[PDB]
């Protein structure tokens, strides 16, 4: 057996990843700031195998995917573009930020609209 690696206390630990779910409704910017506060950042989706637990998460949550209007691209925090393979993207109304929903979906939403959020920190 093994320990699941160095995470902030009372966070979910899975496959060298730390997560926390937040019930507090915040807009994108405030959500990001919150995660930053805890030496982390908003959820980045990268691997369906490594993050398969995301397949059972119920509400809608903020993740770290944003529209950069200069590149005209959708970008994760670290700078990479969104793979069309990673998520099913639903654009029901317009916006420059995206929510995560269960079954590796991405809902495009107004960055102002307060939502629950998911923070993630990558273990060492």
């Amino acid at each position, epitope marked *: 057996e093994s320990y699941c690696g160095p995470c902030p206390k009372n966070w979910i630990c899975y496959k060298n990843n730390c997560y926390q779910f937040f019930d507090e409704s915040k807009n994108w910017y405030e959500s990001q700031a919150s995660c930053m506060s805890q030496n982390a950042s908003l959820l980045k989706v990268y691997s*369906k*195998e490594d993050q*398969d637990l995301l*397949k059972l998460v119920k509400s809608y949550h903020w993740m770290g995917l944003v*529209h950069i209007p200069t*590149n*005209g*691209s*959708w970008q994760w925090e670290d700078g990479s*573009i969104l*793979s*069309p*393979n990673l998520l*099913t*993207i*639903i*654009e029901m109304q317009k916006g420059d930020c995206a929510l995560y929903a269960s*079954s*590796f979906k991405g809902y*495009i939403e107004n960055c102002s609209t307060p939502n629950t959020y998911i923070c993630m920190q990558r273990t060492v």
Partner: antibody, heavy 116, light 108 residues
Framework: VQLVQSGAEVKKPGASVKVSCKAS????????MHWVRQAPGQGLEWIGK????????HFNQKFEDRATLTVDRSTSTVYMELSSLRSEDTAVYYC??????????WGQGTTVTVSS | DIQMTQSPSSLSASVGDRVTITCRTS??????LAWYQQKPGKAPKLLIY???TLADAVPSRFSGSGSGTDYTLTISSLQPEDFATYYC?????????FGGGTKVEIKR
């Protein structure tokens, strides 16, 4: 390079068609297999996708009510079954494996003709 | 549903010409645009993915540009093997949709 599809089908209006596609490099992790058709007088239509690994599937609203996708993990085969056929359904049905930015592989096509 | 408009539907050109096909979308697709070439009785072949990235072993005479809703395939010096039907597709929101096609024939 290509992906193996079932042979050509001829069906009556009302009936159903099940097309298979044998997924070449699948090793029990995420493999999104998409389905597109092309009618003689047309460009292409996207029908749906299914991930071999978890059987998760999504459809075009136009087909969601009469299409199904099933996976057989042992044979590595995806079955697209389209269910209340009309003549407009006559087309060439392709499966394709979506890679990181585009489709990595296409199937061979399956001709499906729907007629009285 | 995002609609793709290709332009024009057919074009008659000679070997050596500059050729410019357009794909206009009904809603912003964030550079998730692909260009396909299809010869009769075969499955579509990819040339350009994302608005402007060239696929492997595609000759560099093939070039893609554009940005929001307006995208362009350019063939600088059309070669014999380039007579075909060309298609655009988006890779953004569900469902992905394709263009009507531009059929490129030999002028005489």
């Amino acid at each position: 390079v290509q992906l193996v599809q079932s042979g050509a089908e001829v069906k009556k209006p009302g009936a159903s068609v099940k097309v298979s596609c044998k997924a070449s490099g699948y090793t029990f992790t995420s493999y999104w297999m998409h389905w597109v058709r092309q009618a003689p007088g047309q460009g292409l239509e996207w029908i749906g996708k299914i991930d071999l690994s978890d059987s998760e599937a999504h459809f075009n609203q136009k087909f969601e009510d009469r299409a199904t996708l099933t996976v057989d993990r042992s044979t590595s085969t995806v079955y697209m079954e389209l269910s209340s056929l009309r003549s407009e359904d006559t087309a060439v049905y392709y499966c394709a494996k979506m890679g990181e930015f585009y489709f990595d592989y296409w199937g061979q096509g399956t001709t499906v003709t729907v007629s009285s | 549903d995002i609609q793709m408009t290709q332009s024009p539907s057919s074009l008659s050109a000679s070997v050596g010409d500059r050729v410019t096909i357009t794909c206009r979308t009904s809603g912003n697709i964030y550079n998730y645009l692909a260009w396909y070439q299809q010869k009769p009785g075969k499955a579509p072949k990819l040339l350009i993915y994302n608005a402007k990235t060239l696929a492997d072993a595609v000759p560099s005479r093939f070039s893609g540009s554009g940005s929001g809703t307006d995208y362009t395939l350019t063939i600088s010096s059309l070669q014999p093997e380039d007579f075909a039907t060309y298609y655009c597709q988006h890779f953004w929101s569900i469902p992905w949709t394709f263009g009507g096609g531009t059929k490129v024939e030999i002028k005489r």
